[PDB]
Amino acid sequence: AEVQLVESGGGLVQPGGSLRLSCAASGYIYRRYRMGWYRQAPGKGREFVAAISGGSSTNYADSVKGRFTISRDNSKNTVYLQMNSLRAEDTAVYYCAAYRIVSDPRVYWGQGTQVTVSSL
């Protein structure tokens, strides 16, 4: 079975703005895998942002709860991360991830998409 993760939607935006990240996964992943978003700012490591599906309820980091919204679109096999009320601390490389703890010893990562929040 094919395994592929395609991210998009990043870029530059003013503080208080909105960006929408997407992650199209192959049907083998989108159906039976937990899929989460992680971000890595320059100088730090990857940290949890939001996750969905996989039988588990939707989860958010406390710093983004109420601002970010994760969702699924069955007609596109795509997970979306809506980011509203963005701030400078949100500047990072956002990674889409898919993993299953029970049987698969692997976690699948996307290539990363840049999200910059500059005041100009």
Residue numbers in the entry: 0 to 119
Show sentences the authors wrote.
AT118i4h32 is a nanobody antagonist for the angiotensin II type 1 receptor (AT1R), a G protein-coupled receptor (GPCR) that is a central regulator of blood pressure and renal function. AT118i4h32 directly competes with the binding of small molecule and peptide ligands to the AT1R and is active in vivo, reducing mouse blood pressure to a comparable degree as the clinically used angiotensin receptor blocker losartan. We demonstrate successful use of our software on three polyreactive nanobodies, including AT118i4h32, a nanobody antagonist of the angiotensin II type I receptor (AT1R), where we reduce polyreactivity without compromising binding affinity or target-specific pharmacology. Synthetic nanobodies provide an ideal reductionist system to probe polyreactivity in the context of a fixed framework without the influence of heavy and light chain pairing effects.
Furthermore, a crystal structure of AT118i4h32 displays large patches of positive charge on the protein surface and enrichment of both solvent exposed arginine and hydrophobic residues in the CDR regions. AT118i4h32 variants were displayed on the surface of yeast and all showed reduced levels of PSR binding. Neutralizing the highly basic patch composed of R3035, R3136, and R99108 on the surface of AT118i4h32 with R31D36 and R99D108 substitutions substantially reduces AT118i4h32 polyreactivity. Notably, introduction of an additional arginine residue with the Y29R30 substitution, which introduces a RRR sequence motif into CDR1, reduces polyreactivity, further demonstrating that arginine’s contribution to polyreactivity is position-dependent, which is captured through our machine learning models. In addition, our success in reducing polyreactivity of AT118i4h32, where the humanized framework region differs from clones in the training set, indicates that our methods are applicable to nanobodies from a range of sources and can be fully integrated with existing computational tools to reduce immunogenicity.
